[PDB]
Amino acid sequence: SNFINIHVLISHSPSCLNRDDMNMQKDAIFGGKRRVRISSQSLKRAMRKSGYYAQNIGESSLRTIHLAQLRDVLRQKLGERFDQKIIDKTLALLSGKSVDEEKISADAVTPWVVGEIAWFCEQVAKAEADNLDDKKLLKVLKEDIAAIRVNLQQGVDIALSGRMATSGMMTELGKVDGAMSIAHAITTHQVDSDIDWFTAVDDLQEQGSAHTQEFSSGVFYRYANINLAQLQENLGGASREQALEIATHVVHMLATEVPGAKQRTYAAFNPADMVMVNFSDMPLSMANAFEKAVKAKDGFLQPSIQAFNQYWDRVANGYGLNGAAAQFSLSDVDPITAQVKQMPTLEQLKSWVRNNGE
Amino acid sequence: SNFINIHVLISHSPSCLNRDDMNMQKDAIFGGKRRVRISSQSLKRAMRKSGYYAQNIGESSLRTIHLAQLRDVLRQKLGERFDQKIIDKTLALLSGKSVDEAEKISADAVTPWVVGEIAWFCEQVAKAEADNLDDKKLLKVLKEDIAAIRVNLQQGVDIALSGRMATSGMMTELGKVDGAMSIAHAITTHQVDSDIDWFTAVDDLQAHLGTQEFSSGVFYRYANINLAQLQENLGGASREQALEIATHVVHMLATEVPGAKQRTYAAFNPADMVMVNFSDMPLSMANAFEKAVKAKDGFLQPSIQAFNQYWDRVANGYGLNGAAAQFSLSDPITAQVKQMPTLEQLKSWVRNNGE
Amino acid sequence: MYLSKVIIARAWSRDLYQLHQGLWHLFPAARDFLFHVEKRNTPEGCHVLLQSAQMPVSTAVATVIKTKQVEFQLQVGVPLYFRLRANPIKTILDNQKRLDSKGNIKRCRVPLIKEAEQIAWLQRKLGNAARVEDVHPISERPQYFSGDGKSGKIQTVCFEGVLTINDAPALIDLVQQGIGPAKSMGCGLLSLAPL
Amino acid sequence: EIDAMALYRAWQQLDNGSCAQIRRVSEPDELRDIPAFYRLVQPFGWENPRHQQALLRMVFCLSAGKNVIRHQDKKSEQTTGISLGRALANSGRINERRIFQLIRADRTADMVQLRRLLTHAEPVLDWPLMARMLTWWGKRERQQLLEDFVLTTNK
Amino acid sequence: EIDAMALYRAWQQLDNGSCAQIRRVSEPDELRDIPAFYRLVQPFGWENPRHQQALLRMVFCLSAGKNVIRHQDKKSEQTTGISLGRALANSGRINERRIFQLIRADRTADMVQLRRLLTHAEPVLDWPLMARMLTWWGKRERQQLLEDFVLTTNKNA
């Protein structure tokens, strides 16, 4: 099925994950109750700049409006290509209009992969060939848009999250959308903000009672979605089989990564607290199980898993979604009823996804 | 009964499904309390351009005030079937504007162009080769048989559902379509305060701050179809045919979501409740939520409850004998409206005219 | 042990230095109280949470809203919510060569701005009284004040989190005496609460 | 007396710490509450007190951002600097009815509408014209704002 | 300089959309508020500004309707334009004390009284005479209005 749905439950202290303008924890109100939140872009940057990302998907695309710095890097890395001036020219054509070196300033921050720039440097030969008028060259490369996308097998993140060109030539050729939709990460449960201390201190003194609800480590629900077909389009036409591999890398990262020098709370005991992957015709998110919920029994994770599972049952039956589904749970809870394969470790789930839910 | 009423309760995770000119979340005040809002026009567009619409209802209409692009497009798609000049003549009669193939075209307002109709009209303009009858003469014949033009509307259904407004050319005489679907703006059942996401764009070679306004809500969507009008709009097509389109609308309203900020906020949720009822008079259950519903364990549960109770009250008070059916994931089970375990059963129930 | 909510007229709460000098008039000499700025300015003045060993007496510039007599009986190994505005710093000398008083090189406090240093600082100052199970350190913008008559700055950190009690008297002591420097500038008030 | 352009420069050169405090405010009377404001405005200055309203408006508008409002000296040919109506019109981002709504607005509401318009516009303009109109903010000034906008948008 | 009659024509040919906006106004300073006005008057025009009062008055009077005020050229025989007093008198619809009140009126009140008079009258007149008197609108003009009215109403008897 065209869409792969990734549902993750990951626990870690609410802590220092992502911050507000006044350096307060980001939150969101859901079901009328406050939730700790992690912005999609923060999760995404944590992924792009991850160690695992560097090894298993390659080098991250570099975002910047500093053109002077980029000239320097581009001339350095593309120095083997005979001229610097042509490099300057291609940059000037993609974005208008640069001088040496100087502080000129891109319209807005846009992700530069070096590969495509190199490819454009390869293409500008046609400038001397025809010699093609720059507009003519644009029309000619406008004809074959897919050709540039192949360069995105480096810079994949652009294929996943997409870029927006506001000016120059990159607007005609550089418009990439999709392919990954990722939710903001919200807690399954209440954590409570701005508690009246004046009245908080009333409860404290027992004084003879000497006696509540247990302590707790947070538990976040993360959602992500990938449009395999759009991803394939974004890579310039690529095997499905490869796109699913990219997706599995995304699954692992979504299951394990936490921003800001933090780890999952049970990161030493296993790879993932909960992970489900599901294939579908239409994207579906399971956030609603956590609109009512979740009240703690001992911990939040166990009832979170349960609530999620029950909601999945209800949804699956109600909307009649036959889809390939696979779940990784270490917590033994009343598991799902309908057609989900249970996977003992994360790699098996990844493998299951790699072979298209076979 | 002529009128089919669609009520949906759909809950959404922290998103920004629709925003104003200044990137502010669309809202409305109801019962004196602020509500997040999604425009009807946005829903309708989300439906038209949906994947499901293409599969189950077909080809979406092309709304532009650029006819030259449309000149070229129509020549491309209808060139093999007709003559190039005929196309120009037809468009000029239909829009009331001149074509010099100058790349500027200028229309009054954005109009829903279905290609089928233009082709059908070309079939008629060929008869000009017969006479040719002066355009005014053609107008009388075209004035007599409006129904013939409507049959052609089974491709491009969206106009049949939402209707078009013709100002210029010969669309003013033949192109005025109204009805058949009435759809409300989708408003939250409860009061919302809108959360401000304070984001930055990190330059890897080194402080730019931006705000995005979001909010999570429980939305009440309402829609109405005038089946008789739908039949009229489609060229008289069968009731049996009309209900199918209606069921497709029911499904889309239950499942389809506007795509605004979905990459960054992925609120792809289905609908926790859907009710359909047949009636002589259109009714909306918005007033169940005039009293903004206060959270007891989230907004959804008390929202469903509120909806059912108000429905009970209205049903008893106004004596509404109608075919009625409800689909829930949540069981209070109403007093008396037929319960469907799954969506497909609701759809089938609708297809067989609510019996 | 007295915990109060107090408002100070704006025309008497313009500088951070004035604020304590203004609460000073609630009494009654060494200082025996801590306070936490809740709302800096409103049209009726500045709002504050005042912990002290004596009942505050209302004035025409400092008004008590409500006061409570509270005695602190804390259970061992039970988790608590805490808030603490503090001035986590490091005393050092001196990137500049400047000197003062008896003519030896000057010492100056600098704010601890790296998160790990802050959490370390907090768990350090608490020590055996409690375990910091969870803490979010909020950087607050630097506060400035006037003399009298001198020019100084105070960058503050707001620790919000959960802790666990190891030793009770230690913790009540830490509460009563305050945590960290700048206690006269609205720092050091450890506010506790049950889950 | 009158307020200099020195306020603008002072705003440009002040550290981010204070600017974050000031920028983070819903309404101007709320600007009165926070200290960094008084500290900023003490020179020009708070409080004549005749100047205070103007200073609140000015700082509230400047508060939009470090480079929201960009200052352009008048060209010799123009004979006076590009003015706020012309700027908002020139940027092209702004829709005229949201300005009509500015004309309709009253007290605290008018500025709030304005700051949103400026942030969205990122306009370039001659700062004392804005200061001058902001100092009075009479109906005539507002009407002149609309006039400028329409006239330039037409041209 | 001075304002042309081209304003009258311009008013006649402008679209209903804009004219509905302008027609929808109680007082002239309110005319100042809306955009279509500035768009109408830019040529003649804003911002001289010595002209602006005159233009507000003129447009405010024109705003009565598309053909409320009808323009009739001076006849060769008469060699004098039919003027507003004579017109209001000729129409026969107008009662004289409502003009007395017009003479008595002050600032914004005078125009509003006037606009009201024309719509009810549907007068024909030489437009620049109205323009000329409206440009100054001194006591002399006010008085001349009444004189004209009384005299023609008496002649017509």
UniProtKB/Swiss-Prot annotation, chain B:
Q: Which GO terms describe its biological process?
A: CRISPR-cas system; defense response to virus
Q: Look up the record and report any one GO term of the cellular component aspect.
A: protein-containing complex
Record keyword Repeat present: no
Q: CDD domains, per this entry?
A: Cas7_I-E
Q: Does the keyword RNA-binding apply?
A: yes
Which GO molecular function annotation, any one, does this entry have? RNA binding
Coiled coil, from the record: none
**InterPro entries reported for this sequence:** CRISPR-assoc_prot_CT1975
Q: What induces it?
A: Repressed by H-NS, activated by LeuO. Activated by the BaeSR two-component regulatory system, possibly due to envelope stress. Part of the casABCDE-ygbT-ygbF operon.
Query: Which effects follow disruption of this gene?
Result: Loss of resistance to bacteriophage lambda infection, loss of plasmid silencing. Increased levels of 57 nucleotide crRNA and also 2 and 3 spacer-repeat units.
Pfam families noted in UniProt: Cas_CT1975
Recite the UniProt keywords alphabetically.
Antiviral defense, RNA-binding
Q: How does it assemble?
A: Part of the Cascade ribonucleoprotein complex, with stoichiometry CasA(1),CasB(2),CasC(6),CasD(1),CasE(1)-crRNA(1). The 6 CasC subunits make a helical stack forming a groove in which the crRNA lies. Interacts directly with all of the Cas subunits. Stable subcomplexes of CasBCDE-crRNA and CasCDE-crRNA also form, both of which are able to bind target dsDNA, and at least CasCDE is able to form R-loops. CasCDE and CasCE complexes have endonuclease activity. Interacts with YgbT (Cas1). Binding of target ssRNA or dsDNA causes a conformational change in the Cascade complex.
* Functional description taken from the UniProt entry: CRISPR (clustered regularly interspaced short palindromic repeat), is an adaptive immune system that provides protection against mobile genetic elements (viruses, transposable elements and conjugative plasmids). CRISPR clusters contain sequences complementary to antecedent mobile elements and target invading nucleic acids. CRISPR clusters are transcribed and processed into CRISPR RNA (crRNA).
Q: What is this protein called?
A: CRISPR system Cascade subunit CasC
Q: Which organism is it from?
A: Escherichia coli (strain K12)
Swiss-Prot record, chain C:
For this UniProt record, the keywords arranged alphabetically read as follows: Antiviral defense, Endonuclease, Hydrolase, Nuclease, RNA-binding
For this protein, the Enzyme Commission number is 3.1.-.-
- Explain the induction of this protein: Repressed by H-NS, activated by LeuO. Activated by the BaeSR two-component regulatory system, possibly due to envelope stress. Part of the casABCDE-ygbT-ygbF operon.
One CC-aspect GO term? protein-containing complex
Tell me, what is one Gene Ontology molecular-function annotation carried by this entry?
Answer: RNA binding
User: Which sequence ranges are marked TM in the entry?
Assistant: none
Q: Which segment of the chain is annotated as a signal peptide?
A: none
Pfam families, alphabetically? CRISPR_assoc
Consequence of gene loss (knockout): Loss of resistance to bacteriophage lambda infection, loss of plasmid silencing. Decreased levels of crRNA, increased levels of pre-crRNA, prevents pre-crRNA cleavage.
Q: Which Gene3D superfamilies match?
A: Crispr-associated protein, domain 1, Crispr-associated protein, domain 2
Report the top EC class in one word.
hydrolase
Q: Which SMART domains match?
A: CRISPR_assoc
Entry annotated with the keyword Hydrolase = yes
Name the GO terms of the biological process aspect.
CRISPR-cas system; defense response to virus; RNA processing
Q: Does the keyword section mention RNA-binding?
A: yes
Q: What is the effect of changing residue 20 to A?
A: Loss of pre-crRNA cleavage
Function field? CRISPR (clustered regularly interspaced short palindromic repeat), is an adaptive immune system that provides protection against mobile genetic elements (viruses, transposable elements and conjugative plasmids). CRISPR clusters contain sequences complementary to antecedent mobile elements and target invading nucleic acids. CRISPR clusters are transcribed and processed into CRISPR RNA (crRNA). CasE is required to process the pre-crRNA into single repeat-spacer units, with an 8-nt 5'-repeat DNA tag that may help other proteins recognize the crRNA. This subunit alone will cleave pre-crRNA, as will CasCDE or CasCE; cleavage does not require divalent metals or ATP. CasCDE alone is also able to form R-loops. Partially inhibits the cleavage of Holliday junctions by YgbT (Cas1). Yields a 5'-hydroxy group and a 2',3'-cyclic phosphate terminus.
Please report which protein family the annotation says this sequence is part of.
Belongs to the CRISPR-associated protein Cas6/Cse3/CasE family. Subtype I-E/Ecoli subfamily.
Q: What is this protein called?
A: CRISPR system Cascade subunit CasE
Source organism per UniProt: Escherichia coli (strain K12)
From Swiss-Prot, chain E:
Does this entry carry the keyword Hydrolase?
Answer: no
Has UniProt tagged this entry with the keyword Cell inner membrane? Answer: no
Q: Which domain of life is it from?
A: Bacteria
GO biological process entries: CRISPR-cas system; defense response to virus
Specify the inducers.
Repressed by H-NS, activated by LeuO. Activated by the BaeSR two-component regulatory system, possibly due to envelope stress. Part of the casABCDE-ygbT-ygbF operon.
Keyword annotations for this protein, in alphabetical order, are: Antiviral defense, RNA-binding
| GO cellular component terms, semicolon-separated | protein-containing complex
Q: Which residues cross the membrane?
A: none
Disrupted-gene phenotype: Loss of resistance to bacteriophage lambda infection, loss of plasmid silencing. Increased levels of 57 nucleotide crRNA and also 2 and 3 spacer-repeat units.
From the UniProt record, which GO molecular function terms apply? DNA binding; nucleic acid binding; RNA binding
Briefly, what is this protein's role? CRISPR (clustered regularly interspaced short palindromic repeat), is an adaptive immune system that provides protection against mobile genetic elements (viruses, transposable elements and conjugative plasmids). CRISPR clusters contain sequences complementary to antecedent mobile elements and target invading nucleic acids. CRISPR clusters are transcribed and processed into CRISPR RNA (crRNA).
What family name appears in the similarity comment?
Belongs to the CRISPR-associated CasB/Cse2 family.
Q: How does it assemble?
A: Homodimer. Part of the Cascade ribonucleoprotein complex, with stoichiometry CasA(1),CasB(2), CasC(6),CasD(1),CasE(1)-crRNA(1). The CasB homodimer forms a cleft that cradles the 3' end of the crRNA. Interacts directly with crRNA, CasA, CasC and CasE. Stable subcomplexes of CasBCDE-crRNA and CasCDE-crRNA also form, both of which are able to bind target dsDNA. Binding of target ssRNA or dsDNA causes a conformational change in the Cascade complex.
Q: What is this protein called?
A: CRISPR system Cascade subunit CasB
Question: Which taxonomic lineage does the organism of this UniProt entry have?
Answer: Bacteria, Pseudomonadati, Pseudomonadota, Gammaproteobacteria, Enterobacterales
UniProt lists the gene as casB
